[PDB]
Design a protein around this nucleic acid. Sequence first.
RNA 1: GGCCCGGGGCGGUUCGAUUCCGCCCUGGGCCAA
Length: 437
Amino acid sequence: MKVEEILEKALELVIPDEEEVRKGREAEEELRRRLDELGVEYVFVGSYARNTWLKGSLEIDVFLLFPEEFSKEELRERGLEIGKAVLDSYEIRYAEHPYVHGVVKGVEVDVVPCYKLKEPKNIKSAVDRTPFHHKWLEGRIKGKENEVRLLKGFLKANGIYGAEYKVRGFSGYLCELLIVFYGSFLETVKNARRWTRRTVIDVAKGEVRKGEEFFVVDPVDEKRNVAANLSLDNLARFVHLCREFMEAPSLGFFKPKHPLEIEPERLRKIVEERGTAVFAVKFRKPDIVDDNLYPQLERASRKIFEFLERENFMPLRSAFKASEEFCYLLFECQIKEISRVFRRMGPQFEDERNVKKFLSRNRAFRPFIENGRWWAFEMRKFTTPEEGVRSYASTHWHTLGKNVGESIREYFEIISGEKLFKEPVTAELCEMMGVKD
RNA sequence: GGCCCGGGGCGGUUCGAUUCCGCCCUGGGCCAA
């Protein structure tokens, strides 16, 4: 149980055993041939080509090089044609552009079309850059593949490995650049402990400096940030995670944390114990991809949080869960019920013009003076958080994201109490309240 | 689809709004795939 002792056993969870590496080779072999018999210009990229794939995430990425002069349209049509005749099973996926996804000899395969180019400039879509990235990486990551694997396992185990919007963590390309830079997993970890929210890592210049944000400059483009979508808190959890590992290394850092489910009865008690208001917003899940969905959930949650805090309900944290069935926006406030009356700041006493207007407004309670200015008692339209969120949600649906909002407008309900405990959100709430044990 | 910056119009709220809550047009930048 010192770092070395532990990393020895970690390799055993991140590195693909012989039957997984093999099964991959036979795929590539066969996948190679099919392409050759159709005489197609391709190039394997991604972690498979660079043997940097994590044990159990075997996925081959085949990019088809196309003449610079071809139209995007030709690229997809011929790409669709090629992916089609070369895949046991084929399925049309989408991202910046449409591409084919399939399976060969039992393994995942992506068949992406892109332009054959030289010089990063003239890249028309992120996918054009992929070839350069791989080109810049192949010679430099050689002999450190397992260091990359250890770093991917770590991030994966602590729920921050992907860069898609559902994670906002460290992309795979970010992982290898880090190794190229620090030489190994441990060095990366040891140095990360001194990372701040202002750290900039210029792989190309082999330098580390201070910027205006966490920035890992792409060796292939000096203006692009590889860790651009790494959220601030996710960067925080990592720095802290390295700090801990280094203080007491454990094989537990590479093992996914167990769900740790709680009986609802217990959950209720804690909420009773916390004395806070806990409720969730339930609406149907828009039939869209996670990359559009999650950023919307974040928006919705945020807009409602801010409605709650400006409306003096003292919210503590927000959260959200997504299912096949519905989406849950969760909340916790310090105020279960506020008074109807509240005070409104009026003009200063010596402004006759405004004082008069401020008084022309007939009110139920008759304003008063305090510290040189007039004030007024006013009544609220709602006195509980839920009551407030039913109002805000019913009228502000349009500001909660294009999709999420359109779904909320057509349906939603506010759940709380026991009826809430039983919904598919128990885990999220435990994280939102730091329930421990 | 989401985030950043900027223009032109509006609505509501307020003694008072460029300034708070929001809506329509609209220019550029960026992110995930």
